[PDB]
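Late entry, zinc ion complex.
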Amino acid sequence: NAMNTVCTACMATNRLPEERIDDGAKCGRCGHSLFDGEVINATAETLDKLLQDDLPMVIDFWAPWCGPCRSFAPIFAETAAERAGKVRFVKVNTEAEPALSTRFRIRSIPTIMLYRNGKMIDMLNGAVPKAPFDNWLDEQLSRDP
Ligand SMILES: [Zn+2]
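Prediction complete; structure with ligand written out below:
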């Protein structure tokens, strides 16, 4: 069976086998590693294209000068690297991207939201340490669609 994933560099859709031999796949338009484990900073122009990915996608809605946002950031990044082939990690600076923040009706920061196949699966209210963050992800991903 096939699935679609989005090139985090050029936004191209790339069709891949659901069951992969490795994670070395490269974007067919631009050569970019499809699974580089890097956090992605989304804007009003990229977010919706990113949501077309069939990979699970966790989104951190944050702001500058926000203590829990600061402490969550490195945890978000490190987790991102550990799951390069399974989950994409996206960040939205609510102050850079006010229309996005309004559209997603963000009521606290940070807000951490998991999206799967266009569905909003669950959100965390605030920052958490890495282990409870890893547990939350695993639990939500093992959940039935
Ligand atoms: Zn590309």
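The longest helix spans residues 67-82. Will revisit in the morning.
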